[PDB]
Write a structure and sequence with these properties.
InterPro entries: NA-bd_OB-fold, RNA-binding_domain_S1_IF1, S1_domain, TIF_IF1. 7% of the residues lie in helices and 49% in strands. The chain is built from one helix and five strands; from the N terminus they run βββαββ.
Length: 72
């Protein structure tokens, strides 16, 4: 009733913009938009651009992803 996975990749936050979102650059040289999830939010974190993070891309559009896990 709901089969669907995602592409977990690593990316470095290149910039941080309002709306609880930020820009991330992949080692491939490309860049993608990412949004924060409610999980890492519960952990209560405050990451700042320039930090590496894991980017989760959605099969709905490899143009946007989301950060749900940043290095310790």
């Amino acid at each position: 009733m709901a089969k669907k996975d995602v592409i977990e990749l690593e990316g470095t936050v290149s910039e941080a913009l309002p709306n609880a979102m930020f820009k991330v650059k992949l080692e491939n040289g490309h860049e993608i938009l990412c949004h924060i999830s409610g999980k890492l939010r519960m952990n209560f974190i405050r990451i700042l651009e320039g930090d590496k993070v894991n980017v989760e891309l959605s099969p709905y559009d490899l143009t946007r992803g989301r950060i749900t896990w940043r290095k310790k």
